């Protein structure tokens, strides 16, 4: 509403061009999703609702927020879906229930994979957009393994 501020904050925030992080309350925020030009919601949860907005695709990454969970195997295909939506001109929103561990880990992976950032730089960007972003320590280890794989693959430099 062209006012006047919005009392409640938006349920997401911009991390980088065409990339947003948020929480599951975004699912129902149809008008905000359309206004931001989001075309893909990456729902990193097993049971959180998805969007029902016109022109907005959902991809669900059904992982528990647990250090023993295998986020790693999901990272490469998830990041590829994200990049394809981005290169086709849409924006991507990555959310989980509370916008903390799972969505942070996925956004961090994407920034390393497709924006050329080291793990530390990528996580700093997520943290700046959303201070409560905090991948669990199991996911942090998996992100380090992904980073090393990216280096071996010449996607990231050793530096």
């Amino acid at each position: 509403s062209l006012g006047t501020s919005e009392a409640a904050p938006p349920p997401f925030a911009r991390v980088a061009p065409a990339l947003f992080i948020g929480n599951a309350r975004a699912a129902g925020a149809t008008e905000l999703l359309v206004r931001a030009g989001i075309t893909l919601c990456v729902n990193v949860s097993r049971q959180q609702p998805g969007p029902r907005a016109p022109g907005v695709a959902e991809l669900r990454v059904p992982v528990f927020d647990d250090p023993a969970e295998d986020l790693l195997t999901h990272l490469e295909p998830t990041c590829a879906a994200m990049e394809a939506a981005v290169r086709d001109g849409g924006s991507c929103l990555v959310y989980c229930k509370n916008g903390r561990s799972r969505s942070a880990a996925v956004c961090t992976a994407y920034l390393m994979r497709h924006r050329g950032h080291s793990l530390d730089r990528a996580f700093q960007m997520v943290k700046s957009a959303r201070p409560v972003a905090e991948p669990n320590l199991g996911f942090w280890a998996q992100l380090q393994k992904y980073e090393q794989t990216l280096q071996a693959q010449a996607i990231l430099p050793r530096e």
Copy 2:
């Protein structure tokens, strides 16, 4: 089991290198998934179960099998996730509840997008692997629109 045949058929079939189509009974077929080297299940449903197999990622594409449903917007990011899993060496299984409309449409999209096949050739390949494959007519129209977009993008030839 090295026998002796398998009484019940496998819940999927090979469409092309690194690409399988099947139904939701595949979700629980842990040993068959591992044996086929499947690393990504694309679950094209809202409520069908996913795999719980080690080293197997799931991506859910939560669309109803209805001609009015917007499969189209999901196609590009879904196919990109599939190609990334494939290029990293895994095989991809695309399933829906009954292995008919939704999974057929997604496999057909992938073959056009990443294997250079026209819509007709791509669908013939799916049909050959799984005769009951049959995208609903709404999805067929969306696939035609995707094909035209791919042509405009120089991904497919006009021929």
